Symmetry: C2
């Protein structure tokens, strides 16, 4: 096993390809990787040229062999040399897998395993995945499962870059709902260092959507994302607190905001499908009361006196749902914001548990959230499908 032996073994595997690769092929590949230390010189160039030739002459026009080629590419992954060749190959195989994900058994699983092996060893990826996920999004298919699992893996590897690329799609109206949906799905996968959203423009544009957009569906997605994001950096949102409180007041009068549409890229109100109240508004109250109760109740008390009284009357049903907060025995309105020991001692799951202890062991919550996301995707499908029909006359 040096080079000629690999060429003959690969071509022989191509003439008769199976799904479980024979042991002697694993042996020839292992001996090649062992007997070649630094293919970064020429060895990688000739290996690349060989894989290109094999793809052109034998694989390109045989989708049933794609999974086998990917399996071989997995074993041959360590020997390409420069990481850009592995990029060039993943990018080359991206669309053939997407186009044959539903028809070739095991191809999606093998390509996922190849992706995970790439990610677990030692922007253009994210943008390509995002744009393609927008394209194939006008039921669930294998192509969307592949795109979704890959997006979650890339976001787990680069959370700051992920939420950066999505911000571009947040600026465009036609993908904001989808972007917020993917953001919720991303947050649902439990990725690390979610606080990096503060070193990214996504958070401010979420708040801008909550403040300006008029579609109940868009604002509701943004609210779900905000509720899922706040427990991961509660001590860093102090400068954003007036906006968050003002956002609560806006959603509190959603039955008026929708009404005012009586004629930054705004999403306008859809009078056909958007309801009159934000379903996830109560949970937002809980997290605000859980994190900064003294500042929150001071905002509700003292923002028109009549408008303030109405804010109070509509906050009454939330007041009767929450116990007295322990901060009332310990902090002032200043020290509530200034003392950060609370956040040093507790992680997101503890902060969530302490908050949910105020409402009159987490996997349940994540499962519920995934069910909610499925419900909302089904609702959007229903909407979109009702739109294609109405108008046809």
């Amino acid at each position: 096993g040096s080079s000629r032996d690999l060429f003959r073994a690969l071509n022989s595997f191509i003439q008769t390809p199976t799904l479980p690769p024979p042991a002697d092929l694993d042996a020839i590949i292992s001996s090649y990787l062992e007997r070649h230390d630094k293919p970064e010189e020429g060895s990688g160039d000739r290996l690349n040229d060989e894989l290109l030739a094999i793809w052109d002459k034998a694989v390109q026009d045989h989708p049933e062999k794609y999974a086998a080629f990917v399996a071989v590419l997995r074993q041959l992954r360590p020997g390409l040399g420069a990481p850009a060749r592995t990029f060039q190959w993943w990018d080359k195989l991206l669309d053939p897998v997407l186009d044959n994900a539903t028809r070739e058994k095991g191809l999606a699983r093998s390509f996922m395993d190849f992706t995970l092996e790439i990610l677990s060893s030692s922007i253009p990826w994210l943008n390509r995945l995002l744009v393609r996920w927008m394209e194939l999004r006008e039921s669930t298919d294998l192509k969307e499962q592949v795109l979704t699992d890959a997006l979650l893996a890339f976001g787990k590897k680069d959370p700051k870059g992920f939420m950066n690329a999505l911000n571009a799609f947040v600026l465009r109206r036609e993908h904001r709902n989808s972007a917020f949906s993917l953001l919720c799905a991303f947050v649902n996968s439990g990725p690390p260092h979610l606080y990096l959203i503060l070193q990214t423009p996504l958070f401010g544009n979420i708040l801008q959507s909550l403040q300006k957009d008029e579609s109940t569906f868009t604002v509701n997605l943004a609210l779900i994302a905000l509720v899922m994001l706040l427990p991961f950096f509660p001590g860093d949102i102090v400068p954003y607190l007036p906006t968050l409180f003002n956002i609560y007041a806006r959603l509190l009068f959603w039955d008026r905001d929708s009404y005012f549409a009586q004629q930054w890229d705004k999403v306008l109100l859809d009078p056909d499908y958007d309801g009159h109240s934000v379903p996830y508004l109560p949970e937002y109250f809980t997290i605000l009361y859980g994190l900064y109760p003294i500042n929150f109740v001071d905002y509700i008390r003292k923002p028109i006196d009549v408008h303030a009284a109405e804010i109070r009357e509509r906050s009454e049903r939330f007041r009767k749902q929450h116990l007295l907060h322990p901060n009332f025995y310990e902090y002032t309105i200043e020290t509530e914001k200034t003392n950060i020991t609370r956040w040093l001692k507790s992680e997101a799951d503890e902060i969530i548990a302490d908050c949910m202890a105020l409402v009159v062991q987490v996997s349940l919550l994540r499962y519920q959230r995934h069910r909610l996301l499925n419900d909302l995707q089904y609702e959007r499908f229903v909407r979109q499908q009702h739109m294609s029909h109405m108008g046809e006359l």
Copy 2:
């Protein structure tokens, strides 16, 4: 037929009353307009003569004499004639309540007739209600009479009781009777603020060392505060300090190991280490002045003691919802804005406070049950005390 009342009385006593006696009495009171000049005085003197010469040593005629005095009560005239007779018959009735049938009920009917017509009474009832201190008919009569007089004159009632609160040997009984008074639902309970009783209740809560005495005072305070919540602002620091003292009752009882208010000392045989009614005190405090209460708990009037106050108030915090005052008032305007109390009555304020706990009859009934339990415990305690010593 109305002129020979004395002849009929002397003939009837010296031997149910016949219909013609009640008829002559009724016609006498009918055609006699203003007996206040003298006819009532001579009637009183004659009834006294009959009592001395014919009734005093004739127990079977006590009930008949009381029935006649009940029917002739409107014609006595001056209210001092009625007081003179009630005072004269008090001890004979109490002494014969158990032996003469219907006598207790007849004297109760006399009391009811007294209540439905237009201090020395209270002092006489109080002194005898201390002298008597299972269940006793004499104590029930004395209690019901004290409660009836207190319902008619609540400010005067409390006033006499304040004297017994000042006596160490009478404080427990005075507070028990006070609890029964507040439970009877008397009017104008805010008048306790125009009397020194409230301040001496707080002084007992601050200084007395008997768990039984302090818990009685706390129960009385809880029953009293909803009747004048807007007037207790100057007392708020004291009430808060009282809560803190009771919050550390298991230390204060222990801390009373080395040492013009006459303190009731700790009774080491039965007094426990915690005040049972302390949570309800928290509830009423949280119901009335939450912003000031939690501000007191956050920073009291050292840091370690404070943290301990916090740690013990945590368990009460987990039982109460967020108060609506936090959407409406500051710590200043909570004391300054009085609109809450203008339209509100005591029962409404109590019901609203009970909206924080995680329509009045049941409360009164439970309270009376508790008061009976405590009186029965006091009986047990005394019965045990008297036997510890006979062995010596």
